[PDB]
């Protein structure tokens with residue numbers, strides 16, 4: 001019910017938090033940059049229904065703030081990852097029940 005994806009932990013660790021997120025069909029998933037940037041929103045891939053390889057955005061924004069929000073509907077588990085933080089181990093997931 002209205003969640004947000006924070007990029008980076010207070011431990012100056014560039015990782016997606018919460019690593020995992022769950023929502024309902026029709027909920028929204030926001031995304032804000034905690035720290036250790038820059039960041040971005042590049043999904044990994046989603047099952048039939050949505051378009052993971054579309055909602056993505058490699059428009060890494062250095063400016064720290066709340067990137068943006070997006071609503072979903074297609075049920076299933078969505079994955080993603082950071083562009084600059086791909087090796088740092090900054091990956092997360094989302095669920096739309």
Ligand SMILES: [Cu+]
Pocket residue numbers: 007008014015036037038039040082083084085090
């Ligand atoms: Cu990142």
